[PDB]
Amino acid sequence: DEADEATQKQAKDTDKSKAQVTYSDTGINNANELSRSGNVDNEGGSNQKPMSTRIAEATSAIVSKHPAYQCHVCSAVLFSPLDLD
Amino acid sequence: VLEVAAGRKYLQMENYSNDDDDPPLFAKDLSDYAKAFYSDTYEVLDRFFWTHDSSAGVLVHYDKPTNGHHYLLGTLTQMVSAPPYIINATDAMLLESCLEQFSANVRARPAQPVTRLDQCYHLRWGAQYVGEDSLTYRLGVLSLLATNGYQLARPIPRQLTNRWLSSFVSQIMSDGVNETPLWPQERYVQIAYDSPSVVDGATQYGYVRKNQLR
Amino acid sequence: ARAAFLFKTVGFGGLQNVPINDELSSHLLRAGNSPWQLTQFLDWISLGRGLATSALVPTAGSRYYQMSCLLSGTLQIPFRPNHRWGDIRFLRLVWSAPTLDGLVVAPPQVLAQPALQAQADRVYDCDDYPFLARDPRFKHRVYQQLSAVTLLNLTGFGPISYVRVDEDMWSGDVNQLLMNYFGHTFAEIAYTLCQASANRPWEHDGTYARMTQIILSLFWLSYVGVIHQQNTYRTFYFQCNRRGDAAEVWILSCSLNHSAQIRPGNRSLFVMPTSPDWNMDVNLILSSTLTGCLCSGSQLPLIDNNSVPAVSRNIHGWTGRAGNQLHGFQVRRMVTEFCDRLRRDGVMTQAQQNQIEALADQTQQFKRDKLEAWAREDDQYNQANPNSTMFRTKPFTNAQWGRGNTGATSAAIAALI
Amino acid sequence: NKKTAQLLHADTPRLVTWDAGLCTSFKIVPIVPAQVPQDVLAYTFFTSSYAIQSPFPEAAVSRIVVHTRWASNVDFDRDSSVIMAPPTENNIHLFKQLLNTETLSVRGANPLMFRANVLHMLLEFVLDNLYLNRHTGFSQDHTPFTEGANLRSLPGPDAEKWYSIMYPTRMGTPNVSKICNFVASCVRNRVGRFDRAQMMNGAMSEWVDVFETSDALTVSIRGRWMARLARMNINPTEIEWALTECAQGYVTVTSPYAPSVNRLMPYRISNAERQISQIIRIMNIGNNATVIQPVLQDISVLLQRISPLQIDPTIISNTMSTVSESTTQTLSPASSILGKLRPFSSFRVALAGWLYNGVVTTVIDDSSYPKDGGSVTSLENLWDFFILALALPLTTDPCAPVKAFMTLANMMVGFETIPMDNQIYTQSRRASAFSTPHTWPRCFMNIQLISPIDAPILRQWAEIIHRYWPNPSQIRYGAPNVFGSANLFTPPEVLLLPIDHQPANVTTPTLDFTNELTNWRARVCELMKNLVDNQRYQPGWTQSLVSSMRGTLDKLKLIKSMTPMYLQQLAPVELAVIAPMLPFPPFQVPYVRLDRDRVPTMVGVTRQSRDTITQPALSLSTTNTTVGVPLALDARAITVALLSGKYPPDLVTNVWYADAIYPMYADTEVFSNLQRDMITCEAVQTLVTLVAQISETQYPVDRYLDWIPSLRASAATAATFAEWVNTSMKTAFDLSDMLLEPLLSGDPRMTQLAIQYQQYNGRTFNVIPEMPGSVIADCVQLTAEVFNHEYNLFGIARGDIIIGRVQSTHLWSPLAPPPDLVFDRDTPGVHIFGRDCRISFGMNGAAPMIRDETGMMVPFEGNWIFPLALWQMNTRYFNQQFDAWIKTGELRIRIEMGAYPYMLHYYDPRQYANAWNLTSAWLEEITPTSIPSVPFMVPISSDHDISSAPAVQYIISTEYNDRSLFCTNSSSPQTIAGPDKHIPVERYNILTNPDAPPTQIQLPEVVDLYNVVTRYAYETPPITAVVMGVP
């Protein structure tokens, strides 16, 4: 998807409906290519349920309750004596 | 592997008439009677036939392969020249060669060289289509005998004729049993311990001399 | 390029008959009816992802053995000089057809007559049996197994494996294929190679034939610690997160950090575990099994008669007069050889080693108590049922448990590079 | 047509399935609530009073129960669950679901059907658990209950509950409660994630091993299931190669080269498996033409779409418009031939037929031969001959040659005569009748019998047939490293052809007459031309008609048709390139030319055996059902094809095919089919293995349920059983078509698969396939082996029962009675009762007496032994005569049952309780067809001194059967009165014994309820997704 996005913007940058240079549908078979997505966490798990939500549910089972001008240096020209200093 | 078409060996003339006294042509006078498969090593030819029909029978000349190592696959054409039989290229080729050796075995002189020591074609692959009662089988026996040095008690004319072949085949197919100790094996060529032949000493592959076979 | 197809049946552990009875056979043929159990074995064993056990088959190494016995028995029927296949039984079993496609219960008239009196340590040549000699493919598929058998029956020890190193093997196609296995376990890989082998038997210097050989080396070179994430073989190396554990799991992986320089040339040797605890190590077994598939089409170097028992010497295609020697080793000890080595390269701490060794100890302790105990159970049975004597697992002796050559072969392997 | 469809596209089984829930099939349930609040332990003692979530039930009594996937959360429901209810409710309905169609009572079930039922039950127990354990995700523990372990998260809301049933070692241990005690004694470190395979930074873990609740059994099942699939896995490159090899180069696809993320793509199966299904395949079609025809038509089209050859009849008409002739003539060779040709379907079909001559033999339709036979005096008939001569050789009919011969012989009658064989197959018999070898006339094989003087033409025609009939050949196809090989009688990769194939060396064709079939046309014409110029035939035609006839024949000979060329150079390839994609792979039998000795005369398949024959190879010859049918084609059409073939102007084979084939290789239907075959075979073996448990087969096999009774099974009960096994399989794999139906014919007790064909000379060829394994089968037999121990957990009790009065205050479990109360056949002074048993009434005060088994007559008192059946066959009479003595008298009977379903009734120990009413009903409701669950009255265990009171019992068991019991007063500190049972440590070995390896199980003697589970996360992409083609 990111590839398509790119090649598609490539088009808009060159004011054409079809991009001449493309980052997708190249002769190359990049079938194994991976992109970072918000689908996985840092422990190789699925973010199907947010880390915070897991942590919550996980602790919720362990709970208990109570019982019942001019510049000769660089040659730049100025206009104010103050602009000079 | 290189598939090379086997060309005609005999070219029939006009006078030919399948006469008793006409010479047998062992089907080698027709279109395609066999297909040859050349390579520079048997291990490969063998593996080649893993994926290739061999029902017709595959012959091999382990002695001096007429042009390099190769296997011969018989076609489905046939020889009718010798009645009342109908021989298949494979059977035919076997037959012609077999007789050729049986002949050489007699004119064998120690100082006189011959083209090949063993002229018999040996059946290497496709024996599962041939029964213990088929000509194709008995020919294997005869071929073996001939290789090992047996001689026909019968006189073999210098020039063959259909009537003769017809007769011979007729004997081969009559009742009786194999009185010798030789039986056909695809595996390799068996050479009796006390056999005169010396092929095993002139080739590096194909023959095996059994010490306990006398 | 192999030309001689011989195999060796198993020998009796001092018994009067092949160490297997009806109760045991019925158990093997439970779901499959063929004696060529490779497939059916690979299922039970379960990707060696946990200790596999049963009532009649307590360990993988047990089923491997039993499988061997069944073949050693039944096969003696069609291999009799006359080559008859369905005229006699072997414990109520008879062959389904000349093409040895399966075993079934004997017809009444055959159960009525006596069984075949199998013998021990026999060596046969496939090409002696017509049906095997006439259909090469059939032969090659089956030999793959008879070999794995032979590789277990040559000595009273564990399954032999063949380790080779040779940069010339690495070709284009090989490189292309190998990369796919990145991430799979040794088992997971072996499993497929086996199947692919059975369908289309490998050639002499074939693509599969080579890669499989390469995998084996990669495994072993890593099992010993010569290669690792910081010193790879062309970036490849097998990883194990829990070395020592009862059920090890090795993963083929990558690393660009370094690639050890390899000496040109071709080098190879044979290895084999000598300690009884192999009956519980799926990798050590599959490793043999694979070198087994290798044998169908390739002729390995001969094995020096002096390394094997009398009975199995001068076996035309296997043991010879001046061959290579077998390098044995104790499983436990190797573990240390493994650690020591890594620690010397500076990738493992002393603390880590201790932590491993410790476990590795606990593991052996377990595996032994069990094996010995089951062993006893067996004798206990054999005394009570003298007509159906057997062995759920290949017999071993107190001596087998020692080190002996473990270190010697540990370096032998390390020398392949 | 139901079959027809299944050949072209069979429902593909649903192999890959995932489970994100717990891998367990047993659940602990509360039977009798906890004793809280109470008069002794203040409520402030029990954990439950603080809302603490416990790993196990907090109750006076808890038992284990079977309930497949009660915790599972899957993607696909295999709708084959096994759900039991707490032992305090009736479960009878699970053991009467099969052969109890004759069982009247609803509360009852027929015992002789028990084994059958139990068996099928186990089968579903397996089927319903065939999933892959999916990996979800974790979260580090933010509390100190565990040392920062990673706890796995289940999906779905209302999840916080699981985290406590999941990990018991996580609970706190403040109490001295039976529960805390257990927990407290477990190793701390074995919880949460255990190990993982992280390969890509920022991707999922390939798999993870983890500790958590589960059951060793179902874990093992799933373990081997994954094991079996793992073997079928293939990778992109293997597929690249495979496909590439099949296409013969015309199509090129690609696989990537780089680190993947592990993909599970099960497709590789053993050749064996392919052959076995190819036989089943053949089976259900043999003899029924209308099933195979549509298959050919399909391939017919496929060809038309890919072949560059086009038939254009105008070719014949053009060359014919230049034939020289006179207008004053009566006949027109030119015209007549056109009107006879009436210038396709039949052509393309005939080719397809070459691939299945195993079951289908194409033949020229009778309608294509002259009605009366024809006469060489009829120009019309001469063209008729022509048409036939040109077509015959394209049919698979092994008798074509003889027909091509006779076809002319029939017209020559009276003109030229030959020596036929006998008086029936005479020289005038319709040529189309010589359909079998036994008919080939002597003179046809021994040409010499045909007089070169009295029958010159006829002879020459024969010499031609002999020397010029096409020579069969072959071509290699397919790629078995991935697809295995369906070939049966031929070698793998071999595809036979009834024609000589000489590959073309160029890509830019040009008319070529150096073809096998081109000569054939030539010869045929030359013959005709000779028949005309025959000194004794030519005088009957006007000198002009001859010239015309000749001219025409020449134009036919020299016609510029491409067909013959195409047939020799391209056709063979096209076929080879298609073969691998067909749903129903080729099935051939050698094409022999004129070697009649080798003509196929029969092909048959077996799927059963005979009497006492157990070896396939022996019963094959006499238990096969012949297969095959003829399909007729139109000679007319076929010829027109051979006469007007034409290639596109600027054709370039190497390009053309590259376009034409590409799309065909974007149809992965092939791969799908493999998976089907895979199942078809699992189904078969699963049948034999189960069937062999209720009946006697020819296969070696385990046996563990022999103690559960079962009726004497007839070939009928056998089939009925099979039918269920069948259904369940389809249901679990979501199949709607056939499977096992082909084999179900009549009796399945001797199923076996094999096929054979036979030559004319009588030589036969057998093919017995090697049965590959079966995971399904092995798994059933596994759970069966476990059932043999954990039987109580499945609601089944083992042994017998003893109906007798036993009153006391004691508190033992009737399911674990005290020894001295039970007696058996070998106990002293016990009376056994057999068949001849009868009863002689009492008189004048005397006592009545029943007859012994040895012929002794005893009074109604003492200890008797009755085999259940005996009572069933006399319920009324017995209940009437004995009940009274059992209740208040001194009679005690032991009914022999073997196995039986049981139901529990708990009671308060401090109050009187008499179980008669319960057992009275049982006895009274026994029938020669049914029995209701045996009822037991057991006491409620207590955790504090309690008074005592009498209790009258009548039924107890013969051996322990209280294994179903998990724990008593689980939340109290100790059980003081009644059966006391602490949490079964044996079941939590990995946790209770520190010296045990994490990966150790205890099957088949004990099912651990907490093990190490391996959860995968492999991807299952569609082939088209990783293997890409290059258009």
Ligand SMILES: [Zn+2]
């Ligand atoms: Zn400035």
